[PDB]
């Protein structure tokens, strides 16, 4: 949770969001059976030459407040522990301690 870690993961977010369609095009080309090796190999080369840091598998979502990688709940944008602080303060709407 350094400053550099947050900046350089914002880099991944930006690069992935900026293309966001060419990956879909190339994967549609590849996944389609009737595409021919002629139109498959060029798609392979296109995928290879494109920068590696523009993939969903390259993204690790962290806390929007501190950047803690582990303990993430995608329902919120919060880490494991700031969720507790926000809930106790009452900022999270509709959230109460449950017994049942």
């Amino acid at each position: 949770a350094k400053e550099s870690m947050k900046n350089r993961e914002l880099k991944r977010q930006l690069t992935v969001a900026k293309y966001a369609k060419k990956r879909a095009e190339l994967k549609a080309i590849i996944a389609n059976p009737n595409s021919s090796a002629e139109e498959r190999w060029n798609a392979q080369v296109a995928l290879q030459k494109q920068p590696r840091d523009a993939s969903a598998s390259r993204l690790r979502n962290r806390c929007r407040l501190t950047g803690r990688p582990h303990g993430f709940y995608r329902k919120f944008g919060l880490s494991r522990n700031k969720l507790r602080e926000a809930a106790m303060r009452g900022d999270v709407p509709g959230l109460v301690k449950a017994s049942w």
Partner: protein, 208 residues
């Protein structure tokens, strides 16, 4: 042992959420993040103004913010151009139009957050803690306030061994749930480190 958060365990029973609205998975995280940022920004800017509670109400594509403070003229100054510049500042945190309401609170010395901040700022000016805590308890007890407990922990004075002190008056029943215990925490950044302040105030028994 560790005590549960008095405000957390009373949510829904007698306490109320500060951020009251509705959303879904598309923008629940966005709305929550915007609320936390706007609260942080408001406190950081008008920390000088005695602000206690910030409520967020979000109808369709709009946000209505009500601010509780003890010094309304600080924000409503000469017809409140401060209000309009504040609105312009807030317009970017959440894209919806903003609406600001300033609420006055009677008896600022019966409010946990204001009392905690006052004690902390007295401590920052090298005032020894016993007199500050005693006078806070005195002022609170002199008007209603069927109970008050004040705790200060850390490197009290300047000794290089931290410790904890606390004074109570009246009754402060934490295990009961009918009670409405106002609770607040604050910090003081002195030359030797951080000193923490906690305040509990018991106002009455909620019947009905």
């Amino acid at each position: 042992g560790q005590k549960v958060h008095p405000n957390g365990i009373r949510l829904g029973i007698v306490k109320e959420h500060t951020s009251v609205w509705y959303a879904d998975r598309k923008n629940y995280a966005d709305y929550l993040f915007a609320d936390l940022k706007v609260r942080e920004y408001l406190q950081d800017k008008l920390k000088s103004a005695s602000v206690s509670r910030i409520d967020i109400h979000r109808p369709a594509q709009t946000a209505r913010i009500t601010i509780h403070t003890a010094r309304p003229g600080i924000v409503i100054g000469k017809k409140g151009e401060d209000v309009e510049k504040l609105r312009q500042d807030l317009t970017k945190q959440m894209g919806v139009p903003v609406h600001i309401n300033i609420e006055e609170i009677r008896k600022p010395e019966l409010d946990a957050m204001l009392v905690a901040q006052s004690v902390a700022q007295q401590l920052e000016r090298r005032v020894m803690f016993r007199r500050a805590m005693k006078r806070a308890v005195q002022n609170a007890m002199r008007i209603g306030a069927k109970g008050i407990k004040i705790q200060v922990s850390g490197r009290l004075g300047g000794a290089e061994i931290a410790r904890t002190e606390w004074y109570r008056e009246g009754r402060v029943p934490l295990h009961t749930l009918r009670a409405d215990i106002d609770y607040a925490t604050y910090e003081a950044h002195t030359t030797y480190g951080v000193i923490g302040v906690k305040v509990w105030i018991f106002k009455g028994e909620v019947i009905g």
